[PDB]
Write an enzyme that holds these catalytic residues in place. Structure first.
Site, PDB file in Angstrom:
ATOM      1  N   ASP A 132       0.913  -1.255   0.016  1.00 42.37           N
ATOM      2  CA  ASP A 132      -0.043  -0.128   0.098  1.00 42.37           C
ATOM      3  C   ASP A 132       0.745   1.318  -0.074  1.00 42.37           C
ATOM      4  O   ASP A 132       0.530   2.204   0.979  1.00 42.37           O
ATOM      5  CB  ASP A 132      -1.080   0.012   1.067  1.00 42.37           C
ATOM      6  CG  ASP A 132      -2.102   0.892   1.261  1.00 42.37           C
ATOM      7  OD1 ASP A 132      -2.499   1.471  -0.088  1.00 42.37           O
ATOM      8  OD2 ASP A 132      -2.762   1.162   2.377  1.00 42.37           O
ATOM      9  N   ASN A 137       0.127   7.497   2.847  1.00 42.22           N
ATOM     10  CA  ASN A 137       0.525   6.860   3.946  1.00 42.22           C
ATOM     11  C   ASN A 137       1.972   7.135   4.302  1.00 42.22           C
ATOM     12  O   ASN A 137       2.889   6.461   5.023  1.00 42.22           O
ATOM     13  CB  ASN A 137       0.815   5.216   3.519  1.00 42.22           C
ATOM     14  CG  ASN A 137      -0.731   4.671   3.250  1.00 42.22           C
ATOM     15  OD1 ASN A 137      -1.724   5.162   4.105  1.00 42.22           O
ATOM     16  ND2 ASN A 137      -0.915   3.646   2.665  1.00 42.22           N
ATOM     17  N   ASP A 150       2.551   4.003   7.645  1.00 39.16           N
ATOM     18  CA  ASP A 150       1.554   3.321   7.815  1.00 39.16           C
ATOM     19  C   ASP A 150       1.795   2.118   7.101  1.00 39.16           C
ATOM     20  O   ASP A 150       1.958   1.925   6.045  1.00 39.16           O
ATOM     21  CB  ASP A 150       0.156   4.195   7.282  1.00 39.16           C
ATOM     22  CG  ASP A 150      -1.101   3.510   7.493  1.00 39.16           C
ATOM     23  OD1 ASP A 150      -1.372   2.264   7.046  1.00 39.16           O
ATOM     24  OD2 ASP A 150      -1.841   4.182   7.974  1.00 39.16           O
TER      25      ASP A 150
END
Length: 256
Positions: A132, A137, A150
């Protein structure tokens, strides 16, 4: 890593998180009587399924030690469950870029891409697949320092084709996503494929369409982005090469 609740002073909400709001606050620790921290909260932590997923992020974070990955400070594992983390005082990267769109020079944007590549090369060195990678993030610790922040429906507009088609995530798929993250940074935090439905994304990728060159983006850098988006995963660069190339591009830009 278990922290006593009475040692944490919960402050202002600073952001939204995948599991609940993120706050800043103070950790009154024996090491340090007033340490600034981020506090991640988890709505519905009374559910064991949710709490397990939330707390897994902390376990993951604990394994890493790198200048451009946010550190775990601790956890509170009684309800309400909190994850205590290093505070990156300038917030989310996307917000930071949009607000500062006309203060930040090109060299800063490139520095952020480089710093993130150093974190991703480190994860690659440990054979860890992130799954991701995206500007949402990333956190901003200082005007010259960003951190991967994250490790927690599907982010289709960031995903490699093989990820969308066959739910396949590898080091090569992370590189595709990093290409998109680089594009985001150079666009001052605009999302990729705006005004397109998640379902039409794969169609365009297969058709050979790629995100266009951002305004004021050096040709060297866009070309690096384009290498990240080779349809065949085996033709994508690795983060060691991306890091080295970004370092040279950063230097050339500083010589301007």
């Amino acid at each position: 890593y278990e922290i006593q609740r009475e040692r944490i002073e919960l402050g202002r909400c600073i952001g939204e998180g995948q599991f609940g709001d993120v706050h800043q606050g103070i950790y009154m620790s024996p090491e340090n009587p007033a340490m600034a921290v981020a506090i991640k909260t988890c709505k519905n932590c009374t559910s064991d399924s949710v709490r397990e997923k939330f707390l897994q992020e902390a376990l993951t974070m604990r394994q890493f030690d790198h200048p451009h990955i946010v550190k775990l400070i601790g956890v509170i594992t009684e309800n309400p469950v909190w994850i205590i983390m290093e505070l990156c005082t300038l917030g989310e990267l996307r917000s930071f870029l949009q607000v500062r769109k006309f203060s930040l020079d090109l060299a800063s944007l490139i520095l952020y891409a480089y710093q993130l590549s150093t974190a991703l090369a480190y994860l690659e060195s440990k054979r860890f697949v992130h799954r991701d990678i995206a500007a949402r993030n990333v956190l901003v610790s200082a005007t010259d320092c960003v951190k991967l922040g994250d490790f927690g429906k599907l982010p289709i507009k960031w995903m490699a084709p093989e990820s969308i088609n066959f739910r396949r995530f590898t080091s090569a798929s992370d590189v595709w996503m990093f290409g998109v993250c680089m594009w985001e940074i150079l666009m001052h935090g605009v999302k990729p494929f705006q005004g397109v439905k998640n379902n039409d994304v794969i169609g365009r990728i297969e058709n050979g369409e790629r995100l266009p060159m951002p305004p004021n983006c050096p040709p060297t850098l866009y070309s690096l982005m384009t290498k990240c988006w080779a349809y065949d995963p085996s033709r994508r660069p690795r983060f060691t090469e991306l890091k080295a190339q970004l370092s040279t591009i950063l230097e050339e830009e500083k010589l301007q």
